[PDB]
Design an enzyme around this catalytic site. Sequence first.
Site, PDB file in Angstrom:
ATOM      1  N   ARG A 185      35.684  44.283  45.700  1.00  0.00           N
ATOM      2  CA  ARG A 185      36.763  43.446  46.198  1.00  0.00           C
ATOM      3  C   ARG A 185      38.071  44.131  45.905  1.00  0.00           C
ATOM      4  NH1 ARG A 185      38.405  38.308  47.565  1.00  0.00           N
ATOM      5  NH2 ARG A 185      39.960  37.232  46.284  1.00  0.00           N
TER       6      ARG A 185
ATOM      7  N   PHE B 175      47.718  43.618  45.475  1.00  0.00           N
ATOM      8  CA  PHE B 175      47.232  42.654  44.480  1.00  0.00           C
ATOM      9  C   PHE B 175      46.424  43.335  43.378  1.00  0.00           C
ATOM     10  CE2 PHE B 175      44.309  38.789  43.641  1.00  0.00           C
ATOM     11  CZ  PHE B 175      44.981  38.475  42.493  1.00  0.00           C
TER      12      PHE B 175
ATOM     13  N   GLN C  12      38.930  45.124  42.172  1.00  0.00           N
ATOM     14  CA  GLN C  12      37.976  44.436  41.314  1.00  0.00           C
ATOM     15  C   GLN C  12      36.593  45.075  41.391  1.00  0.00           C
ATOM     16  OE1 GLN C  12      36.179  40.081  41.543  1.00  0.00           O
ATOM     17  NE2 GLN C  12      38.374  40.087  41.198  1.00  0.00           N
TER      18      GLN C  12
ATOM     19  N   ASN D  41      36.737  36.462  36.113  1.00  0.00           N
ATOM     20  CA  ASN D  41      35.919  35.395  35.553  1.00  0.00           C
ATOM     21  C   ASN D  41      35.674  34.302  36.582  1.00  0.00           C
ATOM     22  OD1 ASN D  41      38.008  33.344  35.356  1.00  0.00           O
ATOM     23  ND2 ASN D  41      38.861  34.517  33.602  1.00  0.00           N
TER      24      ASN D  41
ATOM     25  N   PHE E 132      39.365  43.675  36.768  1.00  0.00           N
ATOM     26  CA  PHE E 132      40.249  44.123  37.820  1.00  0.00           C
ATOM     27  C   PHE E 132      41.373  44.978  37.264  1.00  0.00           C
ATOM     28  CE2 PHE E 132      43.672  40.875  37.411  1.00  0.00           C
ATOM     29  CZ  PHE E 132      43.039  39.890  36.705  1.00  0.00           C
TER      30      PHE E 132
ATOM     31  N   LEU F  91      48.463  34.881  36.845  1.00  0.00           N
ATOM     32  CA  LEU F  91      47.156  34.995  36.209  1.00  0.00           C
ATOM     33  C   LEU F  91      47.237  34.884  34.678  1.00  0.00           C
ATOM     34  CD1 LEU F  91      45.607  37.827  38.408  1.00  0.00           C
ATOM     35  CD2 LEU F  91      45.402  35.360  38.700  1.00  0.00           C
TER      36      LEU F  91
ATOM     37  N   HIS G 162      43.231  34.948  32.789  1.00  0.00           N
ATOM     38  CA  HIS G 162      42.450  36.196  32.701  1.00  0.00           C
ATOM     39  C   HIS G 162      42.941  36.983  31.507  1.00  0.00           C
ATOM     40  CE1 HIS G 162      40.526  35.543  36.578  1.00  0.00           C
ATOM     41  NE2 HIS G 162      41.663  34.939  36.875  1.00  0.00           N
TER      42      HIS G 162
HETATM   43  O1  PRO Z   1      39.251  37.858  42.654  1.00  0.00           O
HETATM   44  C1  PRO Z   1      40.264  37.144  42.574  1.00  0.00           C
HETATM   45  O2  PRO Z   1      40.955  36.975  43.593  1.00  0.00           O
HETATM   46  C2  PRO Z   1      40.725  36.503  41.257  1.00  0.00           C
HETATM   47  C3  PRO Z   1      42.111  37.018  40.909  1.00  0.00           C
HETATM   48  C4  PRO Z   1      41.850  38.289  40.147  1.00  0.00           C
HETATM   49  C5  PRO Z   1      40.625  37.992  39.356  1.00  0.00           C
HETATM   50  N1  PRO Z   1      39.949  36.909  40.079  1.00  0.00           N
END
Ligand code: PRO
Length: 162
Positions: A53, A58, A61, A100, A111, A120, A124
């Site tokens: 992801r 942003f 991940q 999480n 991430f 956040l 996190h």
């Molecule tokens: O995947 C997402 O969008 C959220 C924000 C960063 C960590 N979890």
Amino acid sequence: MSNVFFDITKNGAPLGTIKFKLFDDVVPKTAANFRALCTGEKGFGYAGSHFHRVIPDFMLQGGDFTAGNGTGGKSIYGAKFADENFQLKHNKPGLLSMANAGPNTNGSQFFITTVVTSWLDGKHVVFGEVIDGMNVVKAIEAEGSGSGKPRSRIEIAKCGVC
Ligand code: PRO
């Protein structure tokens, strides 16, 4: 208490190396988990896993080495561990933070931020920071999309302590 690294590939081609410092003085448990997943010492870890992801402007991940899609991963302590603390803030690009599924659900997913993500903070756990290879981070970021679906397979080809 050594720094760690990721050697990254894009569809199998080397992209470069990202090096990180971990904040063991603040979040020793969280830092130890990530370090051990980099070395692979428990018999599993990040080597061969991919970034599932990636959202431009942003974060990137990864860390799901059991399912490869955001549903998996595990810590060196068990399936999940508690949020150690929220002392460190998401105050700059290049921070390592734990992904999480709500409070006290840390596993292996993490991430790397590419912008300040203060919303956040308190949700996190921040535990490290990029010290070299931010250009590689930006190259991965460019393979993302609005939905987070990557345009190519971005793999942690090798990882460990340095
Ligand atoms: O995947 C997402 O969008 C959220 C924000 C960063 C960590 N979890």
